[PDB]
Amino acid sequence: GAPATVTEQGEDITSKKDRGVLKIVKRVGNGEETPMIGDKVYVHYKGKLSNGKKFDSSHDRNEPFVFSLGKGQVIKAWDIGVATMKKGEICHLLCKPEYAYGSAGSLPKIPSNATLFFEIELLDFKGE
Numbered sequence: 714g715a716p717a718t719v720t721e722q723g724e725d726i727t728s729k730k731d732r733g734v735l736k737i738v739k740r741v742g743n744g745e746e747t748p749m750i751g752d753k754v755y756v757h758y759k760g761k762l763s764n765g766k767k768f769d770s771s772h773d774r775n776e777p778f779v780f781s782l783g784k785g786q787v788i789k790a791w792d793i794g795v796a797t798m799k800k801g802e803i804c805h806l807l808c809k810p811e812y813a814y815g816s817a818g819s820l821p822k823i824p825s826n827a828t829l830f831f832e833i834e835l836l837d838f839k840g841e
């Protein structure tokens with residue numbers, strides 16, 4: 714399964730090197746440019762609990778998910794992982810609960826100590 718493949722081949726992109734956020738590039742994006750803190754970022758994604766029956770996709774709602782990079786508007790794994798991406802890149806991300814919703818989780822939807830998996834496509838980014 715895709716989560717096991719990130720475990721095996723995924724680069725640790727954390728500062729602390731605690732494997733809390735693992736990344737594999739599934740499709741290479743354009744040029745060299747990666748987004749800056751405060752850039753307005755547009756993505757499509759697919760998210761699920763790593764071993765769990767909860768699945769969420771922006772493709773469903775026919776609208777890119779938009780947020781402000783590095784400002785704590787998303788879980789930590791995403792502030793870390795999306796800052797590494799190029800435009801048009803698709804990556805897989807495996808996120809320990811430390812970089813997601815933690816010991817608390819976010820009930821009823823997200824349980825305690827949940828490891829999350831994402832496929833993220835970076836569509837665009839532009840300066841705020």
Ligand SMILES: COc1ccc(CC[C@@H](OC(=O)[C@@H]2CCCCN2C(=O)[C@@H]2CCC(=O)[C@@H]3CCCC[C@H]32)c2cccc(OCCN3CCOCC3)c2)cc1OC
Nearest residue numbers: 760761762767768769779780785786787788813814822829
């Ligand atoms: C600093 O720490 C946190 C920061 C923010 C949040 C809010 C949750 C935030 O969602 C997320 O961080 C991630 C990454 C972006 C995709 C959504 N996501 C998830 O976990 C999804 C949420 C929906 C869901 O039930 C999914 C189940 C399968 C796992 C992925 C889950 C989310 C959800 C919905 C909308 C969001 O919008 C950003 C809003 N911005 C820009 C527009 O104006 C308001 C600000 C953001 C929690 C945090 O917990 C530690």
